[PDB]
Design a protein around this ligand. Structure first.
Ligand SMILES: Nc1ncnc2c1ncn2[C@@H]1O[C@H](COP(=O)(O)OP(=O)(O)CP(=O)(O)O)[C@@H](O)[C@H]1O
Ligand SMILES: [N-]=[N+]=NCC(=O)NCCCCN
Ligand SMILES: [Mg+2]
Ligand SMILES: [Mg+2]
Ligand SMILES: [Zn+2]
Length: 420
């Protein structure tokens, strides 16, 4: 029968990752029980959650097997031989679900991506639907496991993950930097967010001691595969393509959707600027705005680099839309849409019609003049100031992009200030 297998929490900060474990588990199924139908899914979840670092993404894949219990056994073996069970950080979870049963997990998954979950719940669910599972330590991996099975994908992107030969691991990666940029020129936007031009950093490569070499994001399999051959790196052992929820803002809740705001949730909301920009300590920029929910702290943190510039040009009265997560009672900006420019009427003194300099007052009510000529004028000129800010959309540079952050290149809207 056809069965969805879901895994996560199989990584420590040492040298495993959920996916590599999942890719192994896949290989073993292809050889013992049956075959993997389609692509595996790499479902990122609520990115604010504690003990998630780094990045919060479960895995799942569909199979055909004559016996369910066998499948589990094979999955169970895999976990035991590869998961860092030593680490109190990691507590693997796995689920096994009928084709026809997965639809029922859409709400649970949705909550896993936009909310916070107790293990109680996942346990209750597994009880309810008589779902075969594996919990190996704490059953925490079971939340993510279920979610990677229930997540419905309206929008989706692809990531071609390439893994190393295990000899190297914890070592550094040899790779051709230019060959990566060259690729991006040729195939953008079919392969987006794999390099930051403005900062000369290749983005699709981890610092971490994990098995990933590169994980390349894109739209088609044809694009992706083109990325591969075009890239020069130290040899590749395993390679899988995952259909993912990266770059879909799937984590975002809109202002029409709830009473209050909470920490550990991400939001899209419209706001008028109250406080103005003011730098803080590490290289940050703060400002408050006003909403249906009251006064709300919004920030661009130092790792946003340039993007701080477009924030620093914010004035009281600006109408804006913000995109980010709420932690420590403040919005960490992913994108921003300047909605209505706030117009500023001012009354400066008359410019002198000869020299160009500003006329100075000539008395209590004696108008203005320019002594360097014999020129004069009696009232003040009112204007609108013309600041360096165009309406529309602005995003953080790709090296500061969060996994779920939908980048401008993928929204068909107007006024998109894509910086390259
Ligand atoms: N919304 C949520 N509420 C509560 N717990 C959640 C949750 N989303 C995920 N979790 C759980 O927290 C744990 C996350 O730590 P984990 O190591 O598994 O990274 P996972 O997907 O985040 C990641 P990666 O491939 O980079 O290595 C998982 O057990 C997961 O099930
Ligand atoms: N493409 N890709 N893979 C991952 C990625 O985009 N990382 C972005 C940079 C995150 C900063 N630590
Ligand atoms: Mg996970
Ligand atoms: Mg873990
Ligand atoms: Zn003059």
């Amino acid at each position: 029968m056809r069965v969805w297998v879901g895994i996560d929490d199989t990584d420590s900060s040492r040298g495993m990752c959920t996916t590599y474990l999942a890719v192994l588990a896949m290989e073993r199924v292809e050889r013992e029980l049956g075959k993997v139908i389609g692509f595996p899914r790499l479902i990122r979840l609520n990115p604010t959650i504690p003990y998630k670092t780094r990045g919060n993404g479960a895995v799942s894949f569909l199979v055909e097997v004559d016996d369910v219990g066998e499948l589990v056994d094979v999955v169970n073996e895999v976990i035991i031989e590869h998961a860092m069970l030593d680490d109190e950080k990691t507590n693997p979870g796995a689920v096994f679900v009928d084709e026809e049963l997965a639809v029922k997990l859409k709400p649970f998954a949705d909550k896993a991506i936009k909310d916070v979950l107790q293990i109680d719940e996942a346990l209750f669910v597994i009880g309810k639907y008589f779902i075969p599972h594996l919990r190996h330590k704490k059953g925490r991996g079971l939340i993510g496991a279920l979610a990677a099975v229930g997540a419905e994908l309206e929008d989706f992107t692809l990531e071609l993950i390439a893994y190393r030969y295990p000899e190297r691991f914890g070592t550094e990666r040899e790779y051709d930097e230019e060959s990566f940029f060259d690729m991006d020129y040729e195939l953008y936007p079919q392969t987006f967010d794999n390099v930051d031009w403005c900062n000369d950093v290749v983005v699709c490569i981890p610092n971490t001691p994990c098995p990933v070499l590169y994980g390349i994001r894109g739209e088609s399999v044809e694009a992706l595969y083109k990325a591969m051959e075009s890239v020069k790196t130290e040899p590749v052992d395993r390679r899988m393509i995952f259909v993912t929820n990266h770059a879909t803002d799937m984590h975002l809740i809109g202002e029409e959707e709830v009473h209050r705001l909470e920490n550990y949730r991400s939001y899209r909301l419209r706001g008028r600027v109250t406080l103005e920009p003011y730098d803080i300590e590490g290289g940050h920029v703060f400002f408050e705005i006003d909403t249906k929910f009251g006064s709300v702290k919004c920030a661009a943190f130092e790792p946003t680099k340039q993007f701080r510039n477009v924030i620093r040009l914010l004035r009281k009265g600006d109408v804006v839309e913000v995109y980010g997560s709420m932690k420590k009672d403040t919005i960490n900006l992913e994108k921003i849409q300047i909605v209505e420019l706030a117009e500023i009427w001012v009354e400066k003194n008359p410019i002198c019609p000869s020299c160009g300099r500003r006329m100075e007052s000539a008395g209590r009510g004696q108008g203005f003049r320019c002594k360097k000529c014999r020129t004069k004028a009696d009232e003040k000129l009112r204007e609108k100031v013309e600041r360096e800010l165009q309406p529309g959309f602005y995003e953080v540079p790709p090296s500061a992009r969060r996994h779920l952050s939908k980048p401008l290149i993928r929204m068909n809207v107007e006024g998109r200030h894509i910086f390259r």
